[PDB]
Design a protein around this ligand. Structure first.
Ligand SMILES: [Ca+2]
Ligand SMILES: [Ca+2]
Length: 126
């Protein structure tokens, strides 16, 4: 049928570009979501200036087809003046979740920065 996949982009901790990159520019972070198997899905949070432990608490909704191999692509970004830098990329295969389930999935980027997401899967179609 059609499922409502809710992603709450909660927070990240110890966002870093490395020692040198952080001395040039303290990360100005945001998260970007993308699920290629659903129409205009690219979504993203607001960025925070010079914040290595950003708290977004932003809720995103994706209407998915359960026949597709739906993989949530999560990118931790740094807002820059010329070109935003991708500090890391994670994938979340929605198959791992079942309708009715709601769970916290933490992702670790570069074995240093933790990004916490809350996922929810429902059968929904109001
Ligand atoms: Ca900055
Ligand atoms: Ca920046």
């Amino acid at each position: 049928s059609s499922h409502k996949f809710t992603v709450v982009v909660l927070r990240a901790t110890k966002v870093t570009k490395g020692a040198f990159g952080d001395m040039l520019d303290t990360p100005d972070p945001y998260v970007e979501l993308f699920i290629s198997t659903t129409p205009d899905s690219r979504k993203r949070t607001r960025h925070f200036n010079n914040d290595i432990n950003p708290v977004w608490n932003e809720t995103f909704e994706f209407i998915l087809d359960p026949n597709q191999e739906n993989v949530l692509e999560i990118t931790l970004m740094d807002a820059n003046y010329v070109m935003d830098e991708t500090l890391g990329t994670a994938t979340f295969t929605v198959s791992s979740m079942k309708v009715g389930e709601k769970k916290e999935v933490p992702f670790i980027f570069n074995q240093v920065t933790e990004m916490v997401l809350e996922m929810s899967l429902e059968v929904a179609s109001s």
